[PDB]
């Protein structure tokens, strides 16, 4: 069977991982007011490096159970199709209740009845996880405050959890689905909610969860959301991102990858959804490609295996001058993180098992330079620009004759043709500088050798 094995908490207790130990990563679809996305459209997520699908299954009715209100269960035939199609495609599925125009709200009786019907229905589907309710409170913790808008969401979480565990004893549960989860303060407020949940459900405020995690969204922004997640992780509670958007929020994704946290992004499986289509490059694949983000996919060969050389495998951050040694190009290999015309490293130095040609340099500071740079060659360096704006881009270069380079950032040309002066010698060094406008974020710096005949020691960036 291609059916995926039950997700489980990882050893580090940071998130749910799959049957191969890898995080869950995926886009979303909806059966709230539309049919289930076709099989071939769901299949496309496998080629975009994903192994999961977020389903907004049904939208709640605030008026329920008043006359003419829409009851839960209306989409059952469409949800069954999503469950079957994900089963057969070897994908994980996270099912939740959506809100339509009523995000930051819920109807407790509607939620209890929804889960009463659906929990037993998919209990045995080992690829299916249950997320209690999307964004049930405007707009994050503490739900347990008597003045939360609206009140009683923790009672709903408790009640639905018990319903789920009665009929689906082994099914992973994602709790809270906080819209705005930000700062040490946010984590502290979430811990009030968690402690109250745990006391009611486990009889002990400090329960060690075996099959539950905190669902959250990214609307506090990447930095504050990352702080809040790190706090919650330190407190011993796993989490799972279920909805965020920047297109892909590359910055938060990078942080979640570092922290070992699974994620579902708010771009949709075609034909339809309320945001942006995940198969259009401008909303996902190009953002991943341009940034240098990498993970090992469950299916296919994309994204490429690559990353930062040195610096603990983390993106080199700008401030203040930031130096990137030419010899510290990203790992990933020929045609991926660099292109060299011969697979031998002719200089033999520093990285003898990659193709870039590297020699000891006599330049100030010593170390190494890239040499034997031939027309068409290129080198990539994954960096992170905190502050958007104009920077001085400096190349430390040498050459007997003049040469031409062009430098891209996130696959956008920032320099045009850049004529590098002859210095009269391959170890006679000069600094060439050009102003560039850089956008904020994780991005690959690419040196493109338009001609050969120059050596490159290092690259510098500093604000003008
Ligand atoms: O279908 C998914 C939808 O997304 C969920 O909200 C997310 C939230 O989880 C997080 O990721 O932040 C972004 C939120 O997205 C906003 O969601 C609401 C949406 O506007 C509503 O769109 C639906 C409209 O109504 C339906 O239209 C079709 C019709 O046939 C039906 O009867 C209508 O009810 C509604 O009036 C809009 O306010 C924004 O466009 C989007 O950015 C939601 O919980 C889930 O429903
Ligand atoms: O540094 C240079 C190299 O770039 C090449 O062009 O000739 C050999 C020297 O070591
Ligand atoms: Ca070579
Ligand atoms: Ca070369
Ligand atoms: Ca160097």
Numbering used by the authors: 37 to 282, 291 to 363, 372 to 516
Provide the authors' own sentences about this structure as they appear in the paper.
In this enzyme, the key specificity determinant is the Araf appended to O3 of the Xylp bound in the active site (−1 subsite).
The xylotetraose was positioned in subsites −1 to −4 and the Araf in the −2* pocket. O3 (O1 of the Araf at the −2* subsite) makes a polar contact with Nδ2 of Asn139; the endocyclic oxygen hydrogens bonds with the OH of Tyr255. The Xylp in the active site makes strong parallel apolar interactions with Phe310. A surface representation of the enzyme shows that O3 and O2 of xylose units at subsites −2 to −4 are solvent-exposed and are thus available for decoration. At −2, Xylp makes planar apolar interactions with the Araf bound to the −2* subsite.
